Point group: C4
Chain length 81, copies 4
């Protein structure tokens, strides 16, 4: 499979996709600085930069179907399976 | 099973329905000009006008479960299976 | 099973629950007038009043795991399975 | 499998994790005082402080897949299986 997070332009064209190690069921969230957070079936929560490069990957105990929330001070909240 | 994205008035009467290729697990998102986006299990991220006409669809490698998010500049982000 | 939509108070106590005909996997959305919209495994999208009584129920072709969006003019958008 | 709700800093380092009873499919939501809410497959809608301490949990009849929504007045809405 593909396992990618997609970033698509208003005109229908691709901007970038980013690869995780498993399927992306989480829905993306976007913090004040433009960072995109999303979970994967591969265990991690991923921080991707607006241009599509990894920022960091945090590792939890299981797959991530829960979708992140961002609180005022920038904390990212998400559950794990 | 149904497979549509439904537009329904606050009064409860249907406004329009747009048939996609498979079940819509994806929750829609609304951009600045009012375009509605939503994944489809037919592997596409769809984008609909406020009048039920297809604007465009973007082909992903797999089923799109993830619900899209929209950045400040209109970029549409979403994950695929 | 229960099939209910729950409305819980900041203090942990119950305000009301509402019964559908099947399981509630959709996540709720809230329109400007306080109306709560959510889907069910039983096929319908449900409009519930702030006090917990039905407002109307719209019927689609399949179960509703997609979660609704509300656009500016009050349209409710949701997919079906 | 993991079962936690994770709080992670914008820098990527863990802030706290709060163990719930089962997998967290539910996506969290953030209220006015900063309380984080989230369902759990252990049949509860949880509510966490910004410091990883349980505020309260509310027992539903079944697994809570739905992600909560919050009204103007702080009421927490959510659906159950």
């Amino acid at each position: 499979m593909d396992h990618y997070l997609y970033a698509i332009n208003p005109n229908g064209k691709l901007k970038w996709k980013f690869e995780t190690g498993g399927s992306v069921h989480s829905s993306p969230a976007i913090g004040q600085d433009g960072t995109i957070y999303v979970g994967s079936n591969d265990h991690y929560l991923y921080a991707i930069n607006p241009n599509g490069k990894l920022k960091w990957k945090f590792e939890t105990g299981g797959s991530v179907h829960s979708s992140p929330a961002i609180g005022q001070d920038g904390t990212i909240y998400v559950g794990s399976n």
